[PDB]
Amino acid sequence: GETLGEKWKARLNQMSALEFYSYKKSGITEVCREEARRALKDGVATGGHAVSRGSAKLRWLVDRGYLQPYGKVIDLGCGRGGWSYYAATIRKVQEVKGYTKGGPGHEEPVLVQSYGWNIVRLKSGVDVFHMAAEPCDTLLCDIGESSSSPEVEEARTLRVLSMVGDWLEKRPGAFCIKVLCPYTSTMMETLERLQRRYGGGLVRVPLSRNSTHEMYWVSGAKSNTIKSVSTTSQLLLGRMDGPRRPVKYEEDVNLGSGTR
Numbered sequence: 001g002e003t004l005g006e007k008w009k010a011r012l013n014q015m016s017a018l019e020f021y022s023y024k025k026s027g028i029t030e031v032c033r034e035e036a037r038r039a040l041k042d043g044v045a046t047g048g049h050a051v052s053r054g055s056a057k058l059r060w061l062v063d064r065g066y067l068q069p070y071g072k073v074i075d076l077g078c079g080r081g082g083w084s085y086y087a088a089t090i091r092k093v094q095e096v097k098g099y100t101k102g103g104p105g106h107e108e109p110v111l112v113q114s115y116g117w118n119i120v121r122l123k124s125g126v127d128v129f130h131m132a133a134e135p136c137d138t139l140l141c142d143i144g145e146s147s148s149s150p151e152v153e154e155a156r157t158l159r160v161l162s163m164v165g166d167w168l169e170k171r172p173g174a175f176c177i178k179v180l181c182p183y184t185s186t187m188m189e190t191l192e193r194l195q196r197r198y199g200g201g202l203v204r205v206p207l208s209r210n211s212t213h214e215m216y217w218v219s220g221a222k223s224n225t226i227k228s229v230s231t232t233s234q235l236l237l238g239r240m241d242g243p244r245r246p247v248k249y250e251e252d253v254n255l256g257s258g259t260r
């Protein structure tokens, strides 16, 4: 019983290195992030330049009402902190706590002074899967590493989803959770069951590359799982045909400066 997403995964794996390369950015939405690129690679933040592409992904969802962060924000798997620092600029957000693994193969928090930096605390060296859940108003989680195997992507997603369940049981009023693999029938059933229990819906963020089927389970969406997943699968499959399309650019994120 093969889904569209599984056919996309199979075809993605059949691509030559050149085909994959041309495909992965074809027609996507993008932020250029030229302008403080060397500063970031040096490990010094510049003003209100975002520390990662993640700020733009969160911005895209917030600008469209897919969630309205407020109160105490928890950011699981914060990496460099792009989500935490974007959240700190939202008027109703009061406090941001980010946790991430860091160390060798992994992103360390970047320490910056974009607007609202002083209500942000990011901590490295923590395994979020070993943290007991805690009350919060806005729950964010951006964890899930890609794999050429769909069974692996699926298993990795189910572990993430089991982990956030403890946090959702605390009943945050807003959330945004990356779903690395939504495209197997087991995943779709699991996601429907989670939406029945916790609400929200799945959204494809168009700044995601075509090389990942990731979607975001967000409290401000209402979507049908089959509709949102199948539409994404069909978009990704369609971009495999025909000539390569250019990227569409948004304005770089500007998180300003100053305390709150």
Ligand SMILES: Nc1ncnc2c1ncn2[C@@H]1O[C@H](CSCC[C@H](N)C(=O)O)[C@@H](O)[C@H]1O
Residues within 6 Å of the ligand: 051, 052, 053, 054, 055, 076, 077, 078, 079, 080, 081, 082, 083, 084, 099, 100, 101, 102, 106, 107, 126, 127, 128, 129, 142, 143, 144
């Ligand atoms: N068990 C775990 N505990 C803590 N962090 C983890 C983890 N598994 C993966 N991660 C971290 O989750 C992060 C996913 S990256 C998230 C991008 C971030 N939203 C931003 O905007 O910058 C990675 O840095 C990775 O190291």
Ligand SMILES: [Mg+2]
Residues within 6 Å of the ligand: 031, 032, 033, 050, 052, 053, 055, 056, 251, 252, 253
């Ligand atoms: Mg940017």
